[PDB]
Amino acid sequence: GLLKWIKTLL
Ligand SMILES: CCCCCCCCCCCCOP(=O)([O-])OCC[N+](C)(C)C
Ligand SMILES: CCCCCCCCCCCCOP(=O)([O-])OCC[N+](C)(C)C
Ligand SMILES: CCCCCCCCCCCCOP(=O)([O-])OCC[N+](C)(C)C
Ligand SMILES: CCCCCCCCCCCCOP(=O)([O-])OCC[N+](C)(C)C
Ligand SMILES: CCCCCCCCCCCCOP(=O)([O-])OCC[N+](C)(C)C
Ligand SMILES: CCCCCCCCCCCCOP(=O)([O-])OCC[N+](C)(C)C
Ligand SMILES: CCCCCCCCCCCCOP(=O)([O-])OCC[N+](C)(C)C
Ligand SMILES: CCCCCCCCCCCCOP(=O)([O-])OCC[N+](C)(C)C
Ligand SMILES: CCCCCCCCCCCCOP(=O)([O-])OCC[N+](C)(C)C
Numbered sequence: 001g002l003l004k005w006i007k008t009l010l
Helices: 002-009
Strands: none
């Protein structure tokens, strides 16, 4: 999901 994607980018 994009939520985990954003958390990974952070
Ligand atoms: C995490 C949901 C945020 C909802 C508010 C934002 C909506 C507009 C942008 C789209 C955000 C998508 O996000 P995600 O991680 O791929 O959603 C996956 C959701 N399910 C597991 C139910 C399929
Ligand atoms: C900020 C308040 C959030 C409330 C919780 C909302 C949870 C659901 C988020 C859903 C985000 C999009 O996910 P997705 O994988 O593209 O959806 C697959 C299904 N559709 C193609 C019909 C959108
Ligand atoms: C403050 C919160 C902000 C959250 C913002 C999240 C945005 C997530 C956007 C994810 C976009 C992923 O698009 P992609 O796979 O590269 O497709 C690009 C498609 N075209 C080639 C037709 C342009
Ligand atoms: C938060 C954003 C996540 C996006 C992730 C998916 C990227 C790939 C999108 C591929 C579909 C691009 O056509 P659309 O946008 O449906 O065309 C809308 C415009 N018309 C009605 C004129 C056709
Ligand atoms: C602006 C670009 C800066 C580049 C430099 C990065 C420096 C290192 C930052 C390391 C941040 C590590 O992530 P975190 O806070 O533990 O996880 C954020 C997501 N959760 C809270 C859900 C776990
Ligand atoms: C609704 C549309 C409005 C227009 C949005 C225009 C802004 C699009 C920004 C797209 C930026 C793409 O960065 P990327 O290659 O994934 O790098 C991620 C960052 N690091 C390399 C440091 C990890
Ligand atoms: C509430 C949870 C928040 C989690 C936030 C996690 C991300 C932390 C990011 C830490 C940022 C560190 O920036 P800095 O060392 O000055 O590098 C900036 C480098 N550029 C100028 C090239 C972009
Ligand atoms: C750089 C820091 C970015 C922080 C982004 C925070 C986004 C939060 C989105 C939350 C949307 C709602 O989701 P939910 O399933 O009802 O949440 C249940 C969990 N809480 C009770 C803690 C909300
Ligand atoms: C809820 C609001 C959250 C907002 C979070 C904003 C995050 C923005 C991340 C910005 C990441 C920038 O990385 P950077 O090393 O300069 O990129 C690579 C650039 N060079 C190729 C020139 C080295």
